[PDB]
Design a protein around this ligand. Structure first.
Ligand SMILES: CCn1c(=O)c(=O)[nH]c2cc(C(=O)N(C)Cc3cnn(-c4ccccc4)c3)ccc21
Length: 113
């Protein structure tokens, strides 16, 4: 089955592709709790692309499903916290759409390995 190194290269490229869909850069660093003091009274597990990069390099993603789970958390946390009539909520909807396409293609390339 798969060698670890090519899979990690693929997750690195995929994470880069997902982060470039975040043109507002509202998903690339942890939500700043000092500015949003009630954030964790609603969000059980915050996630963002910088944390995902840390997890990737700590070897915490060894299959696609776990990588995709943390991406889905970025989206679902934002949909949960923010009202529907906000830029944030709509940006999460857009990321879900555009990121889903990136992830389907990355899964296809992994299925070659
Ligand atoms: C509505 C809750 N919220 C979400 O729900 C969401 O999905 N993304 C959010 C993204 C930000 C955001 O501006 N960041 C992550 C950039 C940043 C990182 N540090 N500082 C900072 C630090 C010190 C002072 C000023 C700013 C800003 C904010 C809220 C967010």
């Amino acid at each position: 089955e798969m060698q670890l190194t090519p899979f990690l290269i693929l997750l690195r490229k995929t994470l880069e592709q997902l982060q470039e869909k975040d043109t507002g850069n509202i998903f690339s660093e942890p939500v700043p709790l000092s500015e949003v003091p009630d954030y964790l009274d609603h969000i059980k597990k915050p996630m963002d692309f910088f944390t995902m990069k840390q997890n990737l390099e700590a070897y915490r993603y060894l299959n696609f499903d776990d990588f995709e789970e943390d991406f889905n958390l970025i989206v679902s946390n934002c949909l949960k916290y923010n009202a529907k009539d906000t830029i944030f909520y709509r940006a999460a909807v857009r990321l879900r759409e555009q990121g889903g396409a990136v992830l389907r293609q990355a899964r296809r390339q992994a299925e070659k390995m």
